Design an enzyme around this catalytic site. Structure first.
Site, PDB file in Angstrom:
ATOM      1  N   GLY A   7       0.801  -1.216   0.000  1.00  0.00           N
ATOM      2  CA  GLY A   7       0.000   0.000   0.000  1.00  0.00           C
ATOM      3  C   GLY A   7       0.833   1.265   0.000  1.00  0.00           C
ATOM      4  N   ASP A  77       7.508  -5.774   4.132  1.00  0.00           N
ATOM      5  CA  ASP A  77       6.952  -4.435   4.185  1.00  0.00           C
ATOM      6  C   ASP A  77       7.333  -3.700   2.878  1.00  0.00           C
ATOM      7  OD1 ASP A  77       6.203  -1.867   4.610  1.00  0.00           O
ATOM      8  OD2 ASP A  77       7.422  -1.538   6.404  1.00  0.00           O
TER       9      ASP A  77
HETATM   10  N1  LIG Z   1       9.941   3.033  -4.678  1.00  0.00           N
HETATM   11  C1  LIG Z   1       9.914   3.857  -3.643  1.00  0.00           C
HETATM   12  C2  LIG Z   1       9.748   3.353  -2.356  1.00  0.00           C
HETATM   13  C3  LIG Z   1       9.716   4.225  -1.271  1.00  0.00           C
HETATM   14  N2  LIG Z   1       9.854   5.619  -1.465  1.00  0.00           N
HETATM   15  C4  LIG Z   1       9.819   6.518  -0.295  1.00  0.00           C
HETATM   16  C5  LIG Z   1       8.354   6.842  -0.136  1.00  0.00           C
HETATM   17  C6  LIG Z   1       8.182   6.949   1.367  1.00  0.00           C
HETATM   18  O1  LIG Z   1       8.159   8.339   1.733  1.00  0.00           O
HETATM   19  C7  LIG Z   1       9.420   6.277   1.970  1.00  0.00           C
HETATM   20  C8  LIG Z   1       9.052   5.111   2.916  1.00  0.00           C
HETATM   21  O2  LIG Z   1       7.956   4.347   2.409  1.00  0.00           O
HETATM   22  P1  LIG Z   1       6.684   3.925   3.329  1.00  0.00           P
HETATM   23  O3  LIG Z   1       6.393   5.183   4.318  1.00  0.00           O
HETATM   24  O4  LIG Z   1       5.503   3.530   2.531  1.00  0.00           O
HETATM   25  O5  LIG Z   1       7.129   2.734   4.319  1.00  0.00           O
HETATM   26  O6  LIG Z   1      10.167   5.757   0.863  1.00  0.00           O
HETATM   27  C9  LIG Z   1      10.029   6.130  -2.777  1.00  0.00           C
HETATM   28  O7  LIG Z   1      10.158   7.337  -2.995  1.00  0.00           O
HETATM   29  N3  LIG Z   1      10.054   5.236  -3.862  1.00  0.00           N
HETATM   30 MG   LIG Z   2       6.904   1.967   6.165  1.00  0.00          MG
END
Ligand SMILES: Nc1ccn([C@H]2C[C@H](O)[C@@H](COP(=O)(O)O)O2)c(=O)n1
Ligand SMILES: [Mg+2]
Ligand SMILES: Nc1ccn([C@H]2C[C@H](O)[C@@H](COP(=O)(O)O)O2)c(=O)n1
Ligand SMILES: [Mg+2]
Lengths: 192, 190
Positions: A7, A77
């Site tokens: 998500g 996660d």
């Molecule tokens: N492919 C991705 C995966 C993660 N994030 C960044 C988005 C979120 O701000 C941070 C952590 O993800 P989350 O809060 O859903 O655990 O990583 C991103 O820019 N690109």
């Molecule tokens: Mg997270």
């Protein structure tokens, strides 16, 4: 038993997966934001940072999988499925040009490309996610405008809807209380 | 029979490999500069373009490898990290961005050549060979770039001399004489 947790930002993946973990006794695969050396400047200037950032992410996610396949029981996660979602968001927003997008997608399939027993989609409205970033996220995630979070969330639904039949998806109303979400996840898990 | 052709810009890899090809009847693996959509802006502003460019290159080189008994490779996946290191020593890509690539290169990207033919050449010759036989884009950047690249090729040969079936060709020699030398080495393995 391999559980993907799925998500947008602030859906409550770390919370939910930490809870599942306590209940089952499985480890969490968690690309920790605190070790990502791009993250701090990332949101301050999306055009410059995103491409590099998205590359770092595939590298990091692919390196973990060289350790995840050793173990019967895992909780993920976020998965490698969700990474291209972030690149597409920045593309629709004109934050990475066509060329740079083509390079990644091309790359993603013919360089980068993993069998989850369940993919738990923590479905959530952007309002809740936005307030959950305020409550539980990080300093840096406060910096960018909210349109970014709306397109990301829209793109998560889009992804679920294109791939609904291809992955063993299980939708959880992430608006619900954590206790009730966990209750729903444990019963689905017990029945497989 | 798998033949890697190895050396800096303007060593004469396309020339040599096109010649081997005619003689043996093998296809050439040639990441064509004319299809690389980064190349045109690449040299005009190295800081901005290099990282992306070097990524595009691994992608392209890895996609070709998904395609056979007899091959000639004009450049290999070994030589790509050489270009990233050059830009690093020149402070054209910071430590972080370099760490990302190297980390990446080994744990994401990583292929058994019968021979790796190193077209050894001085930077002067290479510079004049780019000048007459390269393209307009390669004329744009200063020459220090070509000197470090060439230095880094020697460095790479010298670190890996024992790990790959290297065969050094004096690329200063006439094309006819180079081909003659390559064919005799090939015949004595074949
Ligand atoms: N492919 C991705 C995966 C993660 N994030 C960044 C988005 C979120 O701000 C941070 C952590 O993800 P989350 O809060 O859903 O655990 O990583 C991103 O820019 N690109
Ligand atoms: Mg997270
Ligand atoms: N990893 C790589 C591979 C190639 N090139 C560029 C440098 C050369 O100018 C061009 C064509 O290579 P060559 O003329 O040596 O065949 O591609 C690059 O910047 N980085
Ligand atoms: Mg060439």
């Amino acid at each position: 038993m391999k559980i993907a947790i799925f998500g947008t930002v602030g859906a409550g993946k770390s919370t939910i997966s930490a809870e599942i973990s306590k209940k089952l006794g499985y480890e969490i695969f968690k690309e920790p934001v605190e070790e990502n050396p791009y993250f701090e400047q990332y949101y301050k200037d999306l055009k410059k940072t995103v491409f590099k950032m998205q590359i770092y992410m595939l590298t990091a996610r692919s390196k973990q999988l060289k350790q995840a396949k050793n173990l019967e029981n895992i909780i993920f996660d976020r998965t490698l499925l969700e990474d291209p979602i972030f690149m597409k968001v920045n593309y629709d927003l004109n934050n990475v040009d066509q060329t740079d997008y083509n390079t990644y997608i091309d790359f993603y399939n013919n360089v980068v490309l993993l069998s989850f027993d369940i993919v738990i989609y923590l479905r959530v409205s952007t309002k809740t996610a936005i307030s959950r970033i305020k409550k539980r996220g990080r300093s840096e995630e406060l910096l960018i405008g909210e349109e970014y979070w709306e397109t990301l969330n829209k793109n998560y639904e889009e992804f679920y809807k294109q791939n609904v039949y291809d992955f063993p998806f299980f939708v959880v109303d992430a608006e619900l209380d954590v206790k009730t979400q966990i209750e729903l996840i444990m019963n689905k898990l017990n029945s497989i």
